[PDB]
Scaffold this motif. Structure first.
Motif: not given
Ligand SMILES: *[B]([O])([O])C1=[C]C2=C([C]=[C][C]=[C]2)S1
Length: 356
Positions: A59-65, A115-118, A146-150, A217-219, A309-314
């Motif tokens: 799910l990538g960032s859809v996990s945040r839901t 920051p966006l990334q740890v 600022l959209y951020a996994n951290s 955050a994305y798992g 809504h939510k988008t998600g990517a890995t």
């Molecule tokens: B989420 O799918 O929007 C994510 C965005 C990033 C992730 C990991 C590393 C960098 C950006 S998960």
């Protein structure tokens, strides 16, 4: 499915797959309450395994839901408050920039430019403390998003601290289990590996790599069936029996901040319905987009007339979930290629607009 649902879905998704060269895809449409499933292509190109309704996608960032709702559930239990300082739940965060940063700021990306990334260099937990202590905010809390996994990742980790449960154990017990999401995992068990699709990046099969705060955050990996059940739960929270979970869902769809036409919830993001997809795209190719936010004081409780809504990517996957509570309508699109967000939103809008 009704031919009307069949036709809009097939006419929209078929060209999407062709244009984006997506190896495998699953879609669920939720329509007047009931789910309708569609699948195409390959979960594993080399082993010739098809996508089915049991295939797991990242799910990538859809996990945040899920993280947002589990946080909301902790609020409803009285374990945490969004108005509390971060330092209440992490006393070792003694650096002075943390004064005035609340769990709300973490959950909504408004802490002042986390920051966006740890960093990958952050392996251990003392590395993680060091990372947050040394971080220098660019802005005061509650002024810019600022959209951020951290940011969301730290919210997840701290939200479950009073419970004494690991984040995974809290998620399983308090969210997945009550909702009968029995094929939804932070860590895919060996029994379920057969169903775990590969992701595809530049033609190569890939799975998401371990990282600090990855679960938060994305798992999450899930099937199209469990994701449809997730959308149903979010469409009709007041039909869920577990009282704190019901509240937690409603808290995650509350509007805390506004940037343009977009409102930030916990994990979820919302716009007033109706909305044009130009606005959806723009209010959601940019590595870093710092945007001033206006506080919604106090937060608006879940608005039924919303596009939620939510988008998600890995590296190897692209997902999207959107629903409209007022219309009892929703969609989930899970793919094992990370393809442009505007194409996801366009397709989802085409489908839902046609059905409302
Ligand atoms: B989420 O799918 O929007 C994510 C965005 C990033 C992730 C990991 C590393 C960098 C950006 S998960």
């Amino acid at each position: 499915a009704p031919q009307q649902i069949n036709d809009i879905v097939h006419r929209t998704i078929t060209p999407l797959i062709e244009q984006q060269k997506i190896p495998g895809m699953a879609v669920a449409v939720i329509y007047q309450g009931k789910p309708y499933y569609f699948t195409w292509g390959y979960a594993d190109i080399a082993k010739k395994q098809p996508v089915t309704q049991q295939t797991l996608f990242e799910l990538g960032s859809v996990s945040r839901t899920f993280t947002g709702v589990l946080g909301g559930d902790a609020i409803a239990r009285g374990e945490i408050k969004l108005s509390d300082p971060t330092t209440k739940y992490w006393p070792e965060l003694t650096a002075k920039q943390w004064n005035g940063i609340t769990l709300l700021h973490l959950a909504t990306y408004t802490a002042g430019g986390l920051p966006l990334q740890v960093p990958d260099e952050v392996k251990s937990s003392s590395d993680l403390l060091r990372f947050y202590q040394n971080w220098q905010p660019a802005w005061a809390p509650g002024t810019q998003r600022l959209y951020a996994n951290s940011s969301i990742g730290l919210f997840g980790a701290l939200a479950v601290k009073p419970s004494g449960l690991s984040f995974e154990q809290a998620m399983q017990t308090r969210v997945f289990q009550p909702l009968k999401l029995n094929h939804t995992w932070i860590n895919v068990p060996p029994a379920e590996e057969k169903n775990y699709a590969w992701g595809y990046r530049e033609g190569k099969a890939v799975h998401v790599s371990p990282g600090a705060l990855d679960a938060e955050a994305y798992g999450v990996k899930s099937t199209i069936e469990d994701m449809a059940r997730w959308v149903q739960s979010n469409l009709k929270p007041l039909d869920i029996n577990e009282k704190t979970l019901q509240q937690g869902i409603q808290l995650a769809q509350s509007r805390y901040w506004q940037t343009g036409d977009m409102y930030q919830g916990l994990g979820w993001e919302m716009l007033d319905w109706p909305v044009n997809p130009d606005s959806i795209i723009n209010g959601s190719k940019i590595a870093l987009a710092a945007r001033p936010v206006k506080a919604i004081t106090p937060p608006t409780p879940a608005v039924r007339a919303s596009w939620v809504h939510k988008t998600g990517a890995t590296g190897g996957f692209g997902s999207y979930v959107a629903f409209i509570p007022e219309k009892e309508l929703g969609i989930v699109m899970l793919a094992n290629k990370n393809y442009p967000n505007p194409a996801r939103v366009d397709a989802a809008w085409q489908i839902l607009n046609a059905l409302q």
